[PDB]
Amino acid sequence: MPVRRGHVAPQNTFLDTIIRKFEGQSRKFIIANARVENCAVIYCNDGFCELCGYSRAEVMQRPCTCDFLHGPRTQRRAAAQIAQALLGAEERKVEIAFYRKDGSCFLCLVDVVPVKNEDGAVIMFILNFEVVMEK
């Protein structure tokens, strides 16, 4: 019987301890369709949103190339590996240095793999994340 209680106060000491665990406790996952309407991901696990600390309407409309997370200072191999990997839709993973909402930065690996059906017909593509250099 959780009471509402019309109050408010600071509390990010212990609740923040689980935040570091969620990083892997639920990992990340994103799926994209070859028929991209706006050239963006179709679905993104709650984790992805929790990682980029963005809004639901801001995470459900971003490219699978982490372009919004890439810059002129980030490795180019990332944008290339992703671009080439998408052009062929073949199993290919690449590490990219993205920035978080906390101001911190780290390198996360992104594997791209197509999703065929019972007939082996690749309809859409799925991608998975994997921390490699958590600075």
Curated annotation (Swiss-Prot):
Changing N45Y: In LQT2; uncertain significance. Changing V41F: In LQT2; uncertain significance. Changing F106Y: In LQT2; uncertain significance. This is Voltage-gated inwardly rectifying potassium channel KCNH2. Changing P72L: In LQT2; uncertain significance. Phosphorylated on serine and threonine residues. Phosphorylation by PKA inhibits ion conduction. Residues 41-70 form the PAS domain. The chain holds residues 1 to 135 of 1159 of the full protein.
